[PDB]
């Protein structure tokens, strides 16, 4: 109640400072958007195996994109960066992070414990220990408080859509978390109830459907094409009752925008 406005305002400042470089992939000589999609999809599976928070997944992805914004990485080491990022995200966010041994295990022993740990140190150095980054998830849970009344399918579907955005650097790297959360929340609301982006959230965020339109057009497409996408771990995960099986919901064909 108190601090909700202060916190939102603070997170809006921080998402700008914590944003990765939109064009970093074109500056990576050895890795592609496709390779990054593969990695993020694997991290989703890792989160599933260890029952990690969605917030942990989002943080790890933010760490990877920022790391790769300033460090060139060969394709054989991309998974090492992702593993270290997920380890850091877990230590930050989880009540009970998995042990390092568990992280070494899920990399099929491609990498050693010493490697994982040295990479943890490198990632902390590159990020200068700046780990409290805003995520799509953090804006979503704030936005969810504006539902009339609360609807679990809306909440789960919006998280699903926010998660899909993590996979595809083109186009989602160019949108801020608060804007992705906005598109995701509207699209979820519209899919489940036919309602839209409430004016109470215009008052809070300053975003309208006009300002959300570009990301929403992108998100609507990703939603429609999701069954055909090469990466499927998110859809599979959101079949679970824990998330009200929302990946089984039909996307709308039109948005009227």
């Amino acid at each position: 109640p108190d601090y909700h406005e202060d916190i939102h305002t603070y997170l809006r400042e921080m998402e700008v400072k914590c944003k990765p470089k939109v064009g970093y992939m074109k500056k990576q000589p050895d890795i592609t958007n496709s390779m990054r999609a593969i990695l993020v999809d694997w991290l989703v599976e890792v989160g599933e195996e260890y029952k990690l928070q969605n917030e942990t997944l989002h943080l790890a992805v933010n760490y990877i994109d920022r790391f790769l914004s300033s460090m060139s990485v060969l394709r054989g080491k991309l998974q090492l960066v992702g593993t270290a990022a997920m380890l850091l995200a877990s230590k930050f966010e989880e009540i009970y992070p998995p042990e390092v041994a568990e992280f070494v295990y899920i990399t099929d022993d491609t990498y050693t414990k010493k490697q994982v740990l040295r990479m943890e140190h490198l990632v902390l150095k590159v990020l200068t220990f700046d780990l409290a980054a805003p995520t799509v998830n953090q804006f979503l849970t704030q936005y969810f408080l504006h539902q009339q009344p609360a609807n679990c399918k809306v909440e789960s579907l919006a998280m699903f859509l926010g998660e899909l955005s993590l996979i595809d650097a083109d186009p989602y790297l160019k949108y801020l978390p608060s804007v992705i959360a906005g598109a995701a929340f509207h699209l979820a609301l519209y899919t489940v109830t036919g309602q839209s982006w409430p004016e109470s959230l215009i008052r809070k965020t300053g975003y309208t459907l006009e300002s959300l339109k570009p990301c929403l057009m992108d998100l609507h497409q990703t939603y429609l094409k999701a069954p055909q996408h090469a990466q499927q771990s998110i859809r599979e995960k959101y079949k679970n009752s824990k998330y009200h099986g929302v990946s089984l919901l039909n996307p709308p064909e039109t948005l009227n925008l």
Binding site: L88, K91, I95, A132
Partner: protein
């Protein structure tokens, strides 16, 4: 920043994962505290949290992290040096006590530090006099962020440990799945009381003892004072039902405004418990100043 530029003066504490030293920057003359952190699970999550959170929190009433010296098997956190902790100061004031203008100044500053934490989505979760540092100019600052965390809005379930027992809020003690900023306010209410009497308000030796001590002081809460209390995971209907005593008897030296504020910080229901932000405007603080400590 690097270790060659520092001359160690003396040990000033031992926390965990390392010793804490008083040191001097040989080039600038600046006096600092060096918290060493020893490095098989890698960087401890407590240090990951402490460093990441402190780097976001720049405020006159929060200990300043100046630098991180980050090497092979060693991690050094460089902090601004502060001369004493509040616990040592209270012990030094055993017999004459702490002047009211100083108590009020310290409480006001603690609330400012805490409101800044909460506005930046940070829970401290270990407020106690040992973790509050004072300087010769009259400043008091929140320190030891090793147990802190970044919270979300709304909160989800966090670690059920948290807060050293004497300062631990009843909602943690009764196992509520959700706790939030109000837990730090509870701790500060206990510390306010302690500054005035110089003895812990609720010095329990176990969780149940802790609860019963609180109940004996503020009355056993029912559904009227705290809706939902009887359904809490660790609530037991066999709990003795103590009458709430005259609140002027809890901290007898406090006059009307002080009692009002204390009572609001020690409200059972986390929703009704005063926020740090709202407390800054309490009439108790109408005449607040910032004098230096009355002792060396």
């Amino acid at each position: 920043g690097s270790m060659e530029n520092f001359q160690k003066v003396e040990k000033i504490g031992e926390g965990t994962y390392g010793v804490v030293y008083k040191a001097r920057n040989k080039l600038t003359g600046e006096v600092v505290a060096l918290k060493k952190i020893r490095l098989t699970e890698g960087v401890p999550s407590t240090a990951i949290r402490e460093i990441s959170l402190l780097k976001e929190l720049n405020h006159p009433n929060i200990v300043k992290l100046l630098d991180v010296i980050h090497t092979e098997n060693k991690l050094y956190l460089v902090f601004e040096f502060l001369h004493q902790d509040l616990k040592k100061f209270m012990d030094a004031s055993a017999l004459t006590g702490i002047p009211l203008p100083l108590i009020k100044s310290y409480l006001f500053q603690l609330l400012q530090g805490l409101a800044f934490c909460h506005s930046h989505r940070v829970l401290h979760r270990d407020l106690k006099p040992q973790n509050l540092l004072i300087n010769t100019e009259g400043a008091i600052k929140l320190a030891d962020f090793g147990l802190a965390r970044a919270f979300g809005v709304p909160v989800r379930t966090y670690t059920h440990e948290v807060v050293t027992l004497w300062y631990r809020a009843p909602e943690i003690l009764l196992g509520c799945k959700y706790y939030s900023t109000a837990v730090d306010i509870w701790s500060l209410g206990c510390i306010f009381a302690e500054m005035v009497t110089r003895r812990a308000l609720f010095p329990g030796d176990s969780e149940i003892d802790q609860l019963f001590r609180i109940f004996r002081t503020l009355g056993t809460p029912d559904e009227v004072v705290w809706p939902g209390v009887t359904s809490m995971p660790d609530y037991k209907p066999s709990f003795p039902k103590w009458a709430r005593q005259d609140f002027s008897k809890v901290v007898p030296p406090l006059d009307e405004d002080g009692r009002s504020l204390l009572s609001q910080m020690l409200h059972y229901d986390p929703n009704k418990r005063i926020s740090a932000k709202a407390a800054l405007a309490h009439p108790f603080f109408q005449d607040v100043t910032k004098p230096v400590p009355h002792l060396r």
